[PDB]
Design a binder for this molecule. Structure first.
Ligand SMILES: *[C@@H]1O[C@H](CO)[C@@H](O[C@@H]2O[C@H](CO)[C@@H](O[C@@H]3O[C@H](CO[C@H]4O[C@H](CO[C@H]5O[C@H](CO)[C@@H](O)[C@H](O)[C@@H]5O)[C@@H](O)[C@H](O[C@H]5O[C@H](CO)[C@@H](O)[C@H](O)[C@@H]5O)[C@@H]4O)[C@@H](O)[C@H](O[C@H]4O[C@H](CO)[C@@H](O)[C@H](O)[C@@H]4O[C@H]4O[C@H](CO)[C@@H](O)[C@H](O)[C@@H]4O[C@H]4O[C@H](CO)[C@@H](O)[C@H](O)[C@@H]4O)[C@@H]3O)[C@H](O)[C@H]2NC(C)=O)[C@H](O)[C@H]1NC(C)=O
Ligand SMILES: *[C@@H]1O[C@H](CO)[C@@H](O[C@@H]2O[C@H](CO)[C@@H](O[C@@H]3O[C@H](CO[C@H]4O[C@H](CO[C@H]5O[C@H](CO)[C@@H](O)[C@H](O)[C@@H]5O)[C@@H](O)[C@H](O[C@H]5O[C@H](CO)[C@@H](O)[C@H](O)[C@@H]5O)[C@@H]4O)[C@@H](O)[C@H](O[C@H]4O[C@H](CO)[C@@H](O)[C@H](O)[C@@H]4O[C@H]4O[C@H](CO)[C@@H](O)[C@H](O)[C@@H]4O[C@H]4O[C@H](CO)[C@@H](O)[C@H](O)[C@@H]4O)[C@@H]3O)[C@H](O)[C@H]2NC(C)=O)[C@H](O)[C@H]1NC(C)=O
Ligand SMILES: *[C@@H]1O[C@H](CO)[C@@H](O[C@@H]2O[C@H](CO)[C@@H](O[C@@H]3O[C@H](CO[C@H]4O[C@H](CO[C@H]5O[C@H](CO)[C@@H](O)[C@H](O)[C@@H]5O)[C@@H](O)[C@H](O[C@H]5O[C@H](CO)[C@@H](O)[C@H](O)[C@@H]5O)[C@@H]4O)[C@@H](O)[C@H](O[C@H]4O[C@H](CO)[C@@H](O)[C@H](O)[C@@H]4O[C@H]4O[C@H](CO)[C@@H](O)[C@H](O)[C@@H]4O[C@H]4O[C@H](CO)[C@@H](O)[C@H](O)[C@@H]4O)[C@@H]3O)[C@H](O)[C@H]2NC(C)=O)[C@H](O)[C@H]1NC(C)=O
Ligand SMILES: *[C@@H]1O[C@H](CO)[C@@H](O[C@@H]2O[C@H](CO)[C@@H](O[C@@H]3O[C@H](CO[C@H]4O[C@H](CO[C@H]5O[C@H](CO)[C@@H](O)[C@H](O)[C@@H]5O)[C@@H](O)[C@H](O[C@H]5O[C@H](CO)[C@@H](O)[C@H](O)[C@@H]5O)[C@@H]4O)[C@@H](O)[C@H](O[C@H]4O[C@H](CO)[C@@H](O)[C@H](O)[C@@H]4O[C@H]4O[C@H](CO)[C@@H](O)[C@H](O)[C@@H]4O[C@H]4O[C@H](CO)[C@@H](O)[C@H](O)[C@@H]4O)[C@@H]3O)[C@H](O)[C@H]2NC(C)=O)[C@H](O)[C@H]1NC(C)=O
Ligand SMILES: *[C@@H]1O[C@H](CO)[C@@H](O)[C@H](O)[C@H]1NC(C)=O
Ligand SMILES: *[C@@H]1O[C@H](CO)[C@@H](O)[C@H](O)[C@H]1NC(C)=O
Ligand SMILES: *[C@@H]1O[C@H](CO)[C@@H](O)[C@H](O)[C@H]1NC(C)=O
Ligand SMILES: *[C@@H]1O[C@H](CO)[C@@H](O)[C@H](O)[C@H]1NC(C)=O
Ligand SMILES: [Ca+2]
Ligand SMILES: [Ca+2]
Ligand SMILES: [Ca+2]
Ligand SMILES: [Ca+2]
Lengths: 388, 388, 388, 388
């Protein structure tokens, strides 16, 4: 087969339809379902699969105790069939680590996992299910990457890494891989002041990443990558529709080239589709915590610092817990346009539900429709009392 | 490969032989078997599989409590190997929703799932395991479809939808899909007064659907579809051998173009094979509840309002619980005729068995034989006391 | 590919080596392992698999209670990978019934399952995983077949059926199938007086079956089938080395054309390889019950009514429970000869171990070696006390 | 496809990166994970898999009691996907026995399992998942082999066997197989005085095996095999960096042609990569017991009896239990050199942790990097108290 080429634009987004949902915590109440977090979705040319970081234990297992913690030797990037739960028996390990990304270039899949202590972490780059390249920490402070899928064009797969402080200036790099080999890396340029957990998608040979400013910003940084020239720029989403969490209330003027102030040293992985009048932003409904999720249609959100929503769709009720969210698309689907998709991590357990001693999640996933479809709300659906 | 063409007639039906049985509730007593309902069977060119709507929980799981309810965000159309039970580890999710149909056109499979609140539901049409088209509710009252397999001819797959009241005039539409794309839809025509949960099969390029009148009728509506012209007609089975449930006792004159009165606002999904002198009708044995199941040979049942049985076969004893039933055939089998097949849903739990708090089912399935085979009876076989 | 042709002779048998063992009862103590009995082994051109009749429940499941009973609606022929246990999640259902046979003809597999009440049973013949032909009971008294693999030559697969009394003259038929279709059947001829549960193998275009006389004989009946002419003969193993169970002690003169007397109305499925000086007989060690298993080299056992052993190999200690045993070979292996193989069913539970309320088994399997290998003994290995 | 040819040299080893980890004991606390020991890793041309000897029971199963014992009829060589745990439902049995080796020659896999009583054991050689050759015990004292992967060149796969005393002179043989057939065997020659559990790898058509002297030596014997000439030599690692366990403290002069004294009648399976200045040795950190694991870069360790480490990497902390370790490589990976890999068995349970009555293990695996990567430590990670 051939390397995928990013030759299409986004389909017109008029609403979102249900794509996938695994009900993992519900099923895991009485099945051998692995404890996970930081999930995402990624497509092969012939299959789409759920991905996540396992904690090396099942939910009902006693080793689920303490799984609020993010980094350990027992974590691994796993994948499993669309909308099935991540079970011990159906999960495929991609690589070992506690921070990851993965994407198919059209011929084979590249997966990257970072492991190690906070001051000595390293990334291993897998291609065609074999280790090919390794990257040592350059700032010795939790080398970390996207936690959702990367995107490839003509064999070149850009990946965003950060190494350094989570609460101040850090060392962000953009690596360009081909068949797992490092073609090039570059230090972050542009006006984005802090970069974490980028969510990316590709269309008419450009790759757009929406990231998390964990330092001073509650507006989201954007990295725009040219995979042919292997260069990039960065800024913030200009819109006063703020989409980090926690965050201040929406003002009437946003910030294009600096963090919007109000909330320090926190954030959540999120995403957006920036496409002129076809622009949709995702965010938690609550400004205080990771609960609820909504999509908002905000024309020219990227460049217009006065832009407001003209349409929306609730995905998860404010009464229900959400979590990380990110973008993916089926680049191998039929048609003349790419259908925008996304997932929302539905975190259950600690810290918000501390009657149990574990932290896990389930997945809900949506794709865009050209129809104006009716909306439902999609909770995790598990009852904590059952786990007591 | 090629689109299947409906070029054969039905094989002569002289009896029925066992085809499949999954014993799901028996096995689920101590295995991770998903709670389901509304099952069916559908064939690929190289495999036949069981299908059903999962409830997003196992039987022994505590989330099985309350699964009598038909619609929730935790349901999904799943498929699994013939005669195996629907387990967490062997079930493949086709799409997310609480009403479905699915069929293979010879090249790829189309699956349709409806999800949403009762007043804002939508259908998503999957083809080759990718979402392709979406249909919003047109009557804002539980958009719903067949709950058994559709049938394709030369790539065109007709599907019957209903939106609107379950106890009065509703808005029924027949959609015609090809590779998941909508070619055409039409409002229901003919003399059928209410349409639910159609069971369909195809033979010498015609498709026949036997449905459920949930309004005033205890005779079954029939929709006859021309997949080439993409048109249809409708009436009722003329025979006084009534096959809905609940139902009045069999009279000596049936009704061809209007509901046979006696039982309002109820019914059950059922099926028939209408083939002149080779006509067989399925029905519950009880006239009051979903218990027992029998096949009855009723010559020209479709057109003769005096027709009575001349042969029969008991499938499930009246002492045992049945449920939904529907038609399917292996359109890719060897031979010069299509072998008529059907399944019977064996519902266990609520409402009839309320010592448990769940509702699930197992599956039994039969195919026709040209031999006059001896009959057995095929119960679910689980003992409720074991679940207490 | 092509139909297999029986062009090779048996390899010289100088000892037996371990081939497969699933430890099903051991593992089933704390895993979802299906209750089975009547197991066997059969090879595809690219894989060899274990086969058995499931009871539609796991061992730890409460529905395991009462599984001593042979016939029910919840039984099915299942297959699963060599030496793995028969689990809910890895078992493939071949067909539904309580008596079976199965074999690959080189192109596709034929499987036959019999189901029904004792007075109205029927066989369904599956080919390429589709139902093709059906056979109704002809004597209305538990239609039953081999319970081990059949053998094919040039597409023709002979199968031995019995219908009628288990304790007197019955109606035995030999059917000849091709691609699941009935070419021919014939009533049993020759001097065998009663036929049950034939174990068969093929070599230089002839098929040899060793069966069970359940009426008056403790010597085993033999059916020799010509799959080209589609004819057969029958007699008994002439050797005074008696191999049924229960049985009298070995005399010095056997019987070629009549039952050897001593034990009425009982027996066990067994096998032999009849090959002149390369002849090996299998039997339980105990003359009273299904315990122990040994192979004995008995030159010209088939034709010499004075023949005694000159070599042997213990497979299962007399202290351990055995059960049914049968023949199979990998007809698609490399080399100029067929390697003789066999399995022994290791029955655990009732009636011999009635502290538990279930009956199940595990499998041990051996193949011949041209070496004179050391012998071990191969028990089931489960401790009943663990199940209490 | 073609036979693999050993045409490449080793990649430069500057550090080790995480390759695989299954967390089997952690997951097995509440999942159907098989009890194992003596694990290893071996690659097919299209997949790499974990291997081990099952004990025919799960960890939580009551039959786990007593699994400290090495040899029984319930053991089997199993394989399962990389970094998944060995479960009842995902494990593939290669052959039956309690001592094994396995390797892919480029076309098909050869697996060898030894079974039997201590005085009558036999090896069965499987090729392309079929039994092909058998070897009877020649010294009648626990015939045993490598317990890690063999290596093939141009279809010829050498395997090291030992039969005889574990505490004195034994009968070691090197067998040369092709497609499972015995080409040749030879008695051990050279200056190695005792040989057990060889760990092998291949590079520029030579095969190097690092073994265990269980008699008088705490330095490791090395067998160097020419797979073309089908001949071999043997000696000890000359370096005073002793790598058996238990062992004396490191002296300043090692021994090339005789055991280094201090510890009798014990040892552990281990490995090394002997490659001039690119030489790395593995060993337990403790000199007294199987705890901890480290890699040490020891230039010309094989030939220089004064050689000391100049670099190292800790794999497992001394505080954590280790066990057997061995070599493997992906001979089918891209690039101009073979990437050195190894696994470490992480033994949990008895004898060191006798609060539980079982003995099992998990696996950690590393591969070499040309980068100087930061190091982590990789414990099994299970808490014994959870199993009480
Ligand atoms: C069946 O399903 C269908 C399909 O899903 C359902 O229909 C959907 O219904 C939902 C809910 O109502 C809609 O979502 C909302 O959309 C509005 C935007 O639409 C309105 O505004 C448009 C823009 O108007 C402005 O510009 C135009 C210029 O052209 C001008 O004409 C106009 O006067 C005004 O100047 C209008 O165009 C639009 O009209 C159109 O659509 C109507 C249908 O909705 C139709 O009737 C009309 O004829 C016309 O066609 C419409 O008036 C979003 O504003 C809204 O999002 C806000 O509100 C939700 C709460 O509901 C909140 O969570 C959001 O975050 C957001 O509110 C926050 O952000 C604002 C921006 O900063 C801020 O100003 C707010 O104060 C608020 O801020 C606070 O909360 C946030 C969040 O916690 C916090 O961060 C802040 O700090 C602060 O605390 C919804 O997304 C769908 O659009 C609609 N879809 C369709 C296809 O119709 C249908 O209801 C279902 N049926 C049933 C029976 O259930
Ligand atoms: C081994 O297995 C074999 C194979 O399975 C077993 O053989 C099978 O046995 C079963 C059970 O007996 C049979 O099923 C029944 O079939 C009859 C129909 O067959 C009879 O009627 C035929 C038609 O006769 C009429 O027309 C001809 C014109 O040509 C005329 O000659 C005749 O005088 C009459 O006018 C006859 O042709 C037929 O004879 C043939 O077959 C005989 C074998 O059966 C053979 O001996 C003959 O020589 C000849 O070859 C035979 O007489 C069905 O009527 C019947 O279905 C009714 O009864 C069951 C209860 O058993 C019920 O559940 C059904 O719903 C139905 O009854 C309801 O509906 C009627 C129509 O509305 C109504 O009139 C009834 O009052 C009743 O209504 C009530 O109940 C329903 C249900 O709850 C409710 O909804 C209503 O409101 C109301 O309350 C059976 O299906 C198989 O046909 C037969 N198969 C074969 C191949 O033989 C064999 O028994 C097994 N062996 C052993 C040892 O077990
Ligand atoms: C490592 O592993 C190896 C390989 O497995 C082990 O070696 C094996 O050891 C076993 C056990 O000893 C052997 O099995 C037995 O074989 C004998 C047959 O071999 C003997 O007889 C041969 C025939 O001799 C006759 O004919 C020749 C004519 O040529 C004539 O010369 C001779 O005088 C006599 O007339 C001999 O050729 C043979 O010698 C050869 O082999 C020797 C090694 O064994 C070797 O030393 C010699 O040099 C020569 O090479 C040998 O003498 C079987 O008879 C026997 O089977 C009977 O006994 C067992 C009990 O052990 C029983 O279960 C069987 O059912 C059977 O006994 C019943 O049936 C008889 C026939 O009806 C009847 O007469 C008996 O009374 C008895 O009947 C009772 O019990 C049954 C069962 O319950 C019941 O139904 C009846 O009603 C009644 O109650 C064994 O199968 C293997 O052959 C041997 N293999 C090899 C390759 O060596 C080795 O031991 C292991 N090492 C260690 C350390 O453990
Ligand atoms: C982030 O990760 C990185 C990457 O992993 C971490 O960096 C790693 O750090 C570890 C730990 O320090 C290092 O492992 C040790 O390596 C040393 C060898 O390196 C030293 O020695 C080299 C050789 O020097 C000699 O020769 C040269 C001739 O050229 C001569 O110049 C010199 O004077 C001397 O004569 C030096 O070249 C080397 O310097 C280089 O590297 C430095 C970085 O380390 C750098 O700063 C320099 O500039 C230069 O580039 C360095 O000095 C091993 O010796 C050591 O292994 C011993 O010690 C461990 C305990 O730590 C023990 O377990 C080992 O078994 C071994 O000690 C036993 O064996 C000896 C030999 O028999 C014996 O003499 C000992 O007494 C001891 O014996 C006892 O214990 C054993 C075991 O129980 C028992 O069997 C005996 O009987 C007895 O009881 C370590 O392996 C890595 O090399 C290093 N990697 C890299 C790439 O830097 C970094 O730390 C991490 N960062 C953070 C913040 O955590
Ligand atoms: C989890 O571990 C903590 C110790 O850190 C303990 O206090 C708590 O009881 C544990 N919870 C359970 C459910 O075992
Ligand atoms: C099921 O839920 C109901 C609450 O709606 C509760 O009363 C009942 O006890 C529950 N049953 C079980 C078995 O937990
Ligand atoms: C099995 O069923 C019988 C009733 O036939 C009952 O007496 C016995 O206690 C049951 N055994 C178990 C273990 O439930
Ligand atoms: C394991 O078996 C021994 C008998 O050898 C027994 O004493 C011990 O209690 C058993 N342990 C468990 C946990 O059953
Ligand atoms: Ca922030
Ligand atoms: Ca009705
Ligand atoms: Ca008998
Ligand atoms: Ca030693």
């Amino acid at each position: 087969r051939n390397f995928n080429n990013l030759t299409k634009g986004l389909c017109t987004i008029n609403s979102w339809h249900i794509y996938g949902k695994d009900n993992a915590v519900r099923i895991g109440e009485s099945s051998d379902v692995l404890v996970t977090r930081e999930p995402y979705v990624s497509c092969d040319p012939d299959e789409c699969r759920f991905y996540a970081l396992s904690q090396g234990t099942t939910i009902r297992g006693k080793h689920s105790n303490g799984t609020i913690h993010d980094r350990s030797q027992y974590r691994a990037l796993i994948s499993w069939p669309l909308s099935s739960p991540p079970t011990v028996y159906n999960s495929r390990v991609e690589c070992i680590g506690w921070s990851s990304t993965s994407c198919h270039d059209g011929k084979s899949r590249m997966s990257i996992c970072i492991s190690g202590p906070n001051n000595n972490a390293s990334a291993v780059v897998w291609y065609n299910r074999r280790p090919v390249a390794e990257i040592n920490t350059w700032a010795r402070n939790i080398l970390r990457t996207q936690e959702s899928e990367c995107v490839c064009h003509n064999g070149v797969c850009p990946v965003v890494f950060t190494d350094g402080s989570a609460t101040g200036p850090a060392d962000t790099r953009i690596y360009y891989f081909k068949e797992g080999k490092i073609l090039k890396w570059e230090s972050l340029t542009g006006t984005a002041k802090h970069i974490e957990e980028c969510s990316c998608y590709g269309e008419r040979t450009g790759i757009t990443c929406t990231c998390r400013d964990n330092w001073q910003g509650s507006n989201r940084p954007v990295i725009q990558i040219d995979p042919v020239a292997m260069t990039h720029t960065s800024q913030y989403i200009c819109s006063p529709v703020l989409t980090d969490n926690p965050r201040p209330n929406d003002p009437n003027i946003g910030k294009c080239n600096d963090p919007y102030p109000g909330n320090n040293n926190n954030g959540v992985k999120g995403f957006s589709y920036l496409d002129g009048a076809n622009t949709w932003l995702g965010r938690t409904i609550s400004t205080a915590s990771r609960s609820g999720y909504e999509m908002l249609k905000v024309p020219n959100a990227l460049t217009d610092d006065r832009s407001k929503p003209i349409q929306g769709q609730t995905i998860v009720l404010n009464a229900d817990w959400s979590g990380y969210s990110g973008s993916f698309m089926d680049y191998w689907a039929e048609g003349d346009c790419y259908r925008a998709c996304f997932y929302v991590e539905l975190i259950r357990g600690r810290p918000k539900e501390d009657k149990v001693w574990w932290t896990s999640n389930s997945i809900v996933s949506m794709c865009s429709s050209t129809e104006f479809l009716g909306q439902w709300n999609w909770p995790d659906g598990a009852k904590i009392e059952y786990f007591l």
